[PDB]
Design a protein around this ligand. Structure first.
Ligand SMILES: Nc1ncnc2c1ncn2[C@@H]1O[C@H](COP(=O)(O)OP(=O)(O)OC[C@H]2O[C@H](O)[C@H](O)[C@@H]2O)[C@@H](O)[C@H]1O
Ligand SMILES: Nc1ncnc2c1ncn2[C@@H]1O[C@H](COP(=O)(O)OP(=O)(O)OC[C@H]2O[C@H](O)[C@H](O)[C@@H]2O)[C@@H](O)[C@H]1O
Lengths: 101, 50, 116, 473, 51, 51, 51
DNA sequence: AAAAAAAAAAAAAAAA
RNA sequence: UUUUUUUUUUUUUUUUUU
């Protein structure tokens, strides 16, 4: 079943907010997946991202900032999220988050 | 049988040339795209292919 | 029902299939005896099937998978069974006169080949 | 020990002056010789069968694969191989109802039932050709399977299905292509079996014509014939010398008129000013009386050869320098005397006899395969054996099934060098436009002439028939 | 050879025959298909092959 | 005696389209009269001929 | 100067289409690199591909 | 009214 | 008749001799 919340984000900059949010949500009993805290090292990271988004990601969260708007990786995983949204018939699958004033 | 929803993560942003129903049409698309992007080209010689 | 090391009489279901030869000599290129291979069928191993259509169907159903390596050996085995000695046989045409034919067919030679 | 020599495997030219021994591989990669912008296709047949034709045309549109690509090359799709547009849009459709086709089929007499069944298509197609604005380059006739069961000689309709002209043959195909000759229209017969057979099943459940592995070859055979019937050049022969025409004479039996009358037919093969080969028919059918003569009386033989030299002199300018007449039956000297007189002095006249009846079966000592195709056993400067049926390595299997029978090639008349004769027969075994195979059993002249003879002996009222094979194959 | 004739009917028949024979031969004894047959005709024939 | 009429009448058995053109209706600019202007001048109306 | 066109594919599954496209592109005058094109294989090519 | 050596017409299936 | 090939039935002619 799908019981994971994926937090896409710009890794070079937004690690702090994403780590805080992931810790808060894990404390709140919600299973959470993110590259900084739950990605398995020494593994095919793109393949794992595809597997988790397509298969187990029940909800998608995007951290949108001045960096994340033009980052390539967030764009790719965002497109995969859109595709799995079309597959699942869930308009509330994705909730972008506005961070930058 | 390969729906566009199941494509790998590194292609979904890229435009996919369609060869599914007409190979010649897709090949013409490839030739036009290569001409537009000015891919280096040699004078056509099918004898090399032979 | 097997001469030398290759079979000649066998079965498929209730039909016995039997190897046969048809021979005739030609003298134009060389004095030679051509032999053609055939497969016939019997219901009990002794009485042949009288229906031409049935026999044709059966022989084609056979000839599906026997290629050269098992047509040639059966033909040579039948010829060797017809042999009178190790190197030839003789047609009995007279009480004192006999026609000696070789039991070994004529060989040809080709300069080209290939591999499987 | 007797020496047998191998003659080189012939090559056939493709687009841009390129050569390829195989036809399927050459077309699948290099395309046809000429550009034929589009094929406007017409379909005549029942509405139910039209669904199958449209489905199979779409099936051909997508490239298809054979089980073993080495044995038979894959099919990259009509639009790719032939670079010509052939779509399911633009098909001019004529419908025949099941009731109308069933009124005629369930007849006691085979001759009249076949005559009226074929007229049912001929009248409609004539009306389409002469009354409708749209142009139809080639006309496909999809025919049901019950018709094929009961539209052929000695095919007896079951007594439970009997519900209810003799100057015509009981064969659907022969009569059908026979009666349309005056209209100059290209036609192609398709059986509803030959199409997407998977619907049709036997008692075991397997399709009767199960080609689950061999879709690619069937598509290749359909597409090349369709392109040729439209007026395109699939491939051309490149080793033909200058000043050579061939002609192939074949004798067929005619039953309508008393005495078999053994009508003879001919086909031509020669080079033309430039490089474009000319492969047409030379049909002036010369009726030959007597039951089993198979030899031309001097007058008609002279007419045949004069016509043949004409359609060369008006097409190149000067007379042929070397002619290779081929036939299944040996020539008597009476024909040769007539032939010699008509010919000018400069030409060298050669009459070559080709036969299969000789029972030679060369087995090899070891190996589960057959003799290489291209070998030649030269008996003497006048006669030889050439295995045009046998193993070739490109198609990975022998064209024949058991150990094949070579062809007895003998220069019955004229002199000829044996090597050149055995070099051109193997070349001629390539240009089969009715079927797209690597090579055929024996040269195309004797088989296209055989086809035109079997078709021209189906209608009595044939007068000056067309000389183009597009109306025949 | 045809046009410079005394009879207009015979010259017209000869001119029509000359074209129609070649057109029929192309239709029936040639491989390449022709959708439309354009007949380019000079002006002397136009002026001297009419009633 | 009408070349066009007889021509189109005799080709009917073969069911083959055709179009008769005069050389003047074609690129007339070669055809010049005594004055020096083309007899069938279509300089201003060539588009309609194409249509 | 980069002028080669790389054709990545599944070699034992997509061999035929890659053959067709590469053999047509080479004839068209476009340099093409593929694993099926080169005959014989060695320990080196794994690195070669990358470079 | 036979001999063998030469003919073509049609059907039936298999696999290409 | 998408084709190809291999068979099996017939039948048929020609050449000779009574
Ligand atoms: N072997 C490696 N190769 C590439 N990048 C690596 C590697 N190891 C660590 N990284 C780090 O991987 C990061 C590549 O990120 P980027 O493409 O630059 O910018 P984004 O904002 O679009 O990345 C956002 C997503 O891509 C991420 O992979 C995550 O999956 C994100 O979800 C670099 O910081 C590298 O230091
Ligand atoms: N790799 C690919 N990924 C997605 N679409 C592709 C791809 N390659 C080709 N296409 C084609 O790009 C075409 C559309 O891409 P666009 O023109 O930019 O956006 P629109 O607003 O005009 O069309 C809305 C459709 O896009 C949605 O996917 C839905 O399918 C919509 O129907 C697709 O039809 C694909 O066939």
């Amino acid at each position: 079943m799908r019981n994971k919340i994926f937090i896409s984000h710009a890794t070079p900059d937004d690690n702090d907010f994403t780590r805080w949010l992931a810790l808060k949500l894990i404390g709140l009993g919600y299973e959470v997946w993110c590259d900084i805290l739950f990605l398995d090292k020494g593994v095919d990271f793109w393949s794992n991202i595809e597997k988790v988004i397509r298969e187990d990601t029940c909800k998608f969260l995007l951290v949108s900032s001045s960096y994340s708007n033009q980052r390539e990786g967030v764009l790719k995983e965002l497109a995969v999220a859109a595709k799995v949204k079309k597959q699942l018939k869930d308009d509330k699958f994705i909730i972008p988050l506005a961070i930058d004033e | 049988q390969l729906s566009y929803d199941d494509i790998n993560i590194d292609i979904v942003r890229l435009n996919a040339i369609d060869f599914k129903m007409s190979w010649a049409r897709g090949l013409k698309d490839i030739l036009e795209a290569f001409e537009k992007q000015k891919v280096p080209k040699e004078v056509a010689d099918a004898s090399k292919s032979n | 029902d097997k001469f030398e090391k290759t079979m000649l009489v066998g079965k498929q279901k209730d039909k016995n299939w039997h190897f046969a030869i048809s021979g005739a000599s030609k003298l134009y290129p060389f004095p030679v005896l051509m032999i053609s291979s055939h497969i016939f069928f019997t219901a009990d191993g002794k009485k042949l099937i009288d229906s031409s259509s049935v026999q044709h169907s059966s022989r084609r159903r056979q000839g599906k998978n026997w290629w050269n390596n098992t047509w040639r050996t059966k033909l040579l085995a039948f010829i060797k069974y017809l042999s009178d000695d190790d190197t030839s046989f003789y047609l009995e045409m007279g009480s004192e006169e006999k026609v000696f034919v070789s039991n070994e067919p004529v060989k040809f030679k080709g300069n080209v080949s290939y591999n499987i | 020990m007797k020496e047998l020599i191998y003659i080189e495997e012939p090559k056939i030219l493709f687009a841009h002056g390129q050569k390829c021994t195989d036809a399927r591989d050459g077309l699948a990669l290099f395309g046809p010789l000429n550009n034929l912008y589009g094929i406007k296709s017409g379909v005549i047949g029942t509405k139910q069968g039209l669904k199958i034709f449209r489905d199979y045309l779409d099936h051909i549109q997508k490239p298809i694969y054979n089980s073993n690509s080495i044995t038979r090359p894959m099919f990259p799709g009509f639009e790719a191989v032939f670079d010509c547009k052939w779509e399911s849009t633009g098909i001019t459709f004529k419908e025949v109802t099941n009731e109308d086709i069933g009124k005629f089929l369930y007849n006691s007499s085979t001759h009249k039932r076949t005559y009226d069944l074929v007229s049912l298509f001929i009248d409609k197609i004539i009306s389409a050709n002469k009354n409708e604005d749209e142009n139809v380059d080639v006309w496909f006739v999809i025919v049901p399977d019950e018709i094929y069961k009961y539209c052929r000689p000695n095919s007896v309709l079951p007594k439970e299905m009997v519900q209810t002209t003799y100057n015509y043959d009981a064969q659907f195909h022969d009569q059908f292509k026979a009666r349309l000759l005056k209209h100059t229209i290209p036609t192609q017969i398709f059986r509803e079996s030959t199409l997407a057979w998977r619907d049709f099943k036997n008692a075991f459940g397997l399709p009767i014509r199960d080609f689950s592995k061999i879709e690619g070859h069937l598509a290749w055979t359909i597409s090349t014939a369709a392109f040729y019937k439209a007026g395109g050049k699939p491939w051309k022969l490149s080793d033909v010398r200058n000043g050579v025409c061939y002609l192939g004479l074949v004798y067929k039996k005619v039953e309508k008129s008393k005495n078999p009358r053994n009508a003879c037919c001919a086909a031509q093969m020669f080079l033309d000013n430039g490089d474009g080969t000319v492969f047409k028919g030379e049909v002036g059918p010369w009726y030959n009386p007597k039951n089993g003569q198979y030899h031309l009386e001097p007058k008609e033989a002279k007419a045949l050869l004069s016509q043949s030299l004409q359609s060369y002199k008006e097409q190149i300018g000067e007379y042929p320098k070397e002619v290779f007449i081929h036939a299944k039956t040996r020539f008597n000297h009476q024909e040769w005397d007539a032939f010699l007189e008509v010919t000018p002095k400069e030409t060298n006249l050669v009459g070559v006899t080709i036969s299969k009846t000789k029972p030679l079966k060369l087995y090899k000592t070891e190996g589960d395969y057959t003799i290489l195709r291209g070998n030649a056993y030269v008996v003497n400067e006048r006669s030889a054996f050439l295995w045009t049926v046998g193993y070739v390595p490109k198609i990975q299997t022998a064209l024949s099934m058991e150990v094949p029978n070579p062809l007895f090639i003998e220069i019955n008349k004229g002199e000829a060098d044996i090597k050149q004769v055995l070099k051109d027969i193997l070349s001629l075994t390539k240009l089969n436009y009715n079927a797209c195979i690597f090579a055929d059993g024996e040269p195309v002249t004797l088989r296209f002439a055989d086809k035109i003879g079997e078709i021209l002996t189906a209608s009595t009222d044939i007068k000056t028939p067309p000389l183009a094979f597009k109306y025949y194959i």
